[PDB]
Design a protein around this motif. Structure first.
Motif, PDB file in Angstrom:
ATOM      1  N   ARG A  48      14.440   7.591 -18.313  1.00  0.00           N
ATOM      2  CA  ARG A  48      13.207   8.296 -18.584  1.00  0.00           C
ATOM      3  C   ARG A  48      12.355   8.265 -17.324  1.00  0.00           C
ATOM      4  NH1 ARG A  48      10.278   6.932 -24.027  1.00  0.00           N
ATOM      5  NH2 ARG A  48       9.233   8.805 -23.239  1.00  0.00           N
TER       6      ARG A  48
ATOM      7  N   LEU B 270      18.782  15.177 -18.334  1.00  0.00           N
ATOM      8  CA  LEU B 270      18.702  14.153 -19.361  1.00  0.00           C
ATOM      9  C   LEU B 270      19.116  14.784 -20.684  1.00  0.00           C
ATOM     10  CD1 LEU B 270      15.382  12.535 -18.163  1.00  0.00           C
ATOM     11  CD2 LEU B 270      17.738  11.755 -17.722  1.00  0.00           C
ATOM     12  N   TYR B 271      20.020  14.119 -21.395  1.00  0.00           N
ATOM     13  CA  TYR B 271      20.642  14.723 -22.547  1.00  0.00           C
ATOM     14  C   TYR B 271      20.262  13.962 -23.813  1.00  0.00           C
ATOM     15  CZ  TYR B 271      24.062  16.641 -25.747  1.00  0.00           C
ATOM     16  OH  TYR B 271      24.617  17.300 -26.814  1.00  0.00           O
ATOM     17  N   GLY B 272      19.740  14.739 -24.759  1.00  0.00           N
ATOM     18  CA  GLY B 272      19.518  14.262 -26.099  1.00  0.00           C
ATOM     19  C   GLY B 272      18.308  13.357 -26.172  1.00  0.00           C
ATOM     20  N   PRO B 273      18.060  12.821 -27.383  1.00  0.00           N
ATOM     21  CA  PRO B 273      16.849  12.051 -27.645  1.00  0.00           C
ATOM     22  C   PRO B 273      16.832  10.684 -26.987  1.00  0.00           C
ATOM     23  CG  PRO B 273      17.699  13.076 -29.658  1.00  0.00           C
ATOM     24  CD  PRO B 273      18.807  13.114 -28.625  1.00  0.00           C
ATOM     25  N   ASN B 274      17.992  10.255 -26.489  1.00  0.00           N
ATOM     26  CA  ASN B 274      18.120   8.974 -25.821  1.00  0.00           C
ATOM     27  C   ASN B 274      18.290   9.151 -24.309  1.00  0.00           C
ATOM     28  OD1 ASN B 274      17.938   6.993 -28.038  1.00  0.00           O
ATOM     29  ND2 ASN B 274      19.718   8.070 -28.807  1.00  0.00           N
ATOM     30  N   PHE B 275      18.074  10.373 -23.805  1.00  0.00           N
ATOM     31  CA  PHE B 275      17.868  10.591 -22.377  1.00  0.00           C
ATOM     32  C   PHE B 275      19.065  10.101 -21.562  1.00  0.00           C
ATOM     33  CE2 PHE B 275      13.542   9.799 -24.088  1.00  0.00           C
ATOM     34  CZ  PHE B 275      12.823  10.891 -23.596  1.00  0.00           C
TER      35      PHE B 275
END
Ligand SMILES: *[C@@H]1O[C@H](CO)[C@@H](O[C@@H]2O[C@H](CO)[C@@H](O)[C@H](O)[C@H]2NC(C)=O)[C@H](O)[C@H]1NC(C)=O
Ligand SMILES: N=C(N)c1ccc2cc(O)ccc2c1
Lengths: 105, 241
Positions: free
Chosen positions: A94, A5-10
């Motif tokens: 998520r 999962l990449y970055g704050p927005n998954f």
């Protein structure tokens, strides 16, 4: 043979052994079952929180798209390189409800 | 925690107290109902075996953490590349034998993703029951403090940690000292809020004294270990990979 999962927005990404890099996966034909499989691959067992399409903000020109005719192979093997997503969205996933306190509203 | 204030209930629902022989040794961070992120240095021999350890979630006061109110640990996994001499790769997982029941006071913190793009001096929080002064005793109540990331180049200065800070480490605190983590905080959270989510950026690892100037906190760089955590969580209960 791996997922993250990449970055704050998954953003769900899958690593390409050939291209030697990580690519987002198109929302094209994706659903909660595919997300659950991705979560299990990240060790989250039966945990799943949410999955939805989001517009890629990274200017990416390389995606991983579901071949809906791949048959009953693992989801990694269902995915092929594509320079665009027909849904115009990538997967945001998520695996667990996390990161909230009593304040967090 | 030096230079902090006591935490309210539910402010840090991921925080646990890891007990051996009915006493707090270290902190930890809940990541799933069964899995806790802690420091490898806490579970060195002779405390490598799981049967020593109980976890206490959702309780701010040590005196309320008595045999039975807590959670038996079933496994202890030190990072394979943990080095006690340098404290490199100072991270470990504990698996509970019984899953926690999440509520308003007990919940998980999010594993850090790649591409968090934190500011170089990102505002974070530390929490724990460690000493509130150097060489002090465990705190009865859970404390917390704001700290800032300190760029690793700055932290490796010969006026700070003389090239001792590895890519598996991050620094946080204040070079002027005064606010810091301390003995007993080890294994516990360094968190930051971003995109309205609380992220586990670090696990309390080491430092030179507590709250001294030019001697900030060093934390396990958790983002470096997220994939390892995934694999351990998956390997658990798995026949073939
Ligand atoms: C999706 O999967 C199908 C079937 O697995 C692919 O179609 C096969 O393509 C090979 C090579 O051209 C042929 O030998 C097979 O006979 C085809 N079988 C079919 C049509 O089911 C299809 O091309 C895949 N799509 C993409 C874009 O990869
Ligand atoms: N200055 C720190 N942040 C710091 C962190 C962890 C520590 C663990 C110990 O056992 C002793 C002192 C410590 C100091």
């Amino acid at each position: 043979a791996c997922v993250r999962l990449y970055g704050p927005n998954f953003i769900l990404q899958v690593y390409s052994s050939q291209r030697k890099s990580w690519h987002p996966v198109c929302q094209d034909d994706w659903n909660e079952n595919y997300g659950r499989a991705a979560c299990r691959d990240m060790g989250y067992k039966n945990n799943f929180y949410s999955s939805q399409g989001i517009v890629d903000d990274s200017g990416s020109t390389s995606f991983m798209k579901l071949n809906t005719s791949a048959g009953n192979v693992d989801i990694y093997k269902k995915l092929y390189h594509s320079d665009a997503c027909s849904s115009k969205a990538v997967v945001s996933l998520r695996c667990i409800a996390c990161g909230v306190n009593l304040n967090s509203d | 925690i030096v230079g902090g204030e006591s935490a309210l209930p539910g402010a840090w629902p991921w925080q646990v107290s890891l007990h051996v022989q009915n006493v707090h040794v270290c902190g930890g961070s809940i990541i799933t109902p069964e899995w806790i992120v802690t420091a490898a240095h806490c579970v060195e021999k002779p405390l490598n075996n799981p049967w020593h350890w109980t976890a206490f979630a959702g309780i701010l006061r040590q005196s309320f953490m008595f045999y039975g109110a807590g959670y038996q640990v079933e496994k202890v996994i030190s990072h394979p590349n943990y080095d006690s001499k340098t404290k490199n790769n100072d991270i470990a997982l504990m698996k509970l034998q019984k899953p926690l029941t999440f509520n308003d006071l007990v919940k998980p913190v999010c594993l850090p993703n790649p591409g968090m793009m934190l500011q170089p001096e990102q505002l974070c929080w530390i929490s724990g029951w460690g000493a509130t002064e150097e060489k002090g005793k465990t705190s009865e109540v859970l404390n917390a403090a704001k700290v800032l990331l300190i760029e690793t180049q700055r932290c490796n200065s010969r006026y700070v940690y003389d090239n001792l800070i590895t890519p598996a480490m991050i620094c946080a605190g204040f070079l002027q000292g005064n606010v810091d983590s301390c003995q007993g905080d080890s294994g516990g959270p360094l968190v930051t809020s971003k995109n309205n989510i609380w992220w586990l950026i670090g696990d309390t690892s080491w430092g030179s004294g507590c709250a001294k100037a030019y001697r900030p906190g060093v934390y396990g760089n958790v983002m470096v270990f997220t994939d390892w955590i995934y694999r351990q969580m998956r390997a658990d209960g798995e026949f073939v990979e």
